[PDB]
């Protein structure tokens, strides 16, 4: 039950950490590598963002995850 102000900020923050910490780089490696082995027309996209969603959550440094779970709590409970 969020102040939609905070939502905008949480979204801006996640992006800033994920750039810094190399998460951005590694996800683009993964996609480029998957597509290179698949074929582009060959792929069935979302047969694709679905496949890697497990891997991407688990690539998140536990330090990043903790700061995020910090603010998400300080919001969901006011």
């Amino acid at each position: 039950t969020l102040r939609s102000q905070d939502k905008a900020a949480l979204k801006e923050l996640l992006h800033t950490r994920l750039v810094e910490c190399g998460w951005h780089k590694d996800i683009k490696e993964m996609i480029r590598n998957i597509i290179m082995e698949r074929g582009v027309d060959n792929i069935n996209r979302d047969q694709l963002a679905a496949q890697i969603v497990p891997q991407a959550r688990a690539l998140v440094p536990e330090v990043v995850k903790n700061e995020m779970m910090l603010r998400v709590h300080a919001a969901l409970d006011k």
Binding site: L10, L14, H15, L18, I27, A56, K65, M69, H73
Partner: peptide, 24 residues
């Protein structure tokens, strides 16, 4: 109770960050 709900927020914002990349 909010526990499960905090996990839905984080997981939704994160799946939305993957698409972020994915579009460009």
């Amino acid at each position: 109770s909010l526990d499960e709900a905090a996990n839905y927020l984080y997981q939704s914002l994160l799946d939305d960050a993957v698409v972020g990349i994915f579009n460009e």
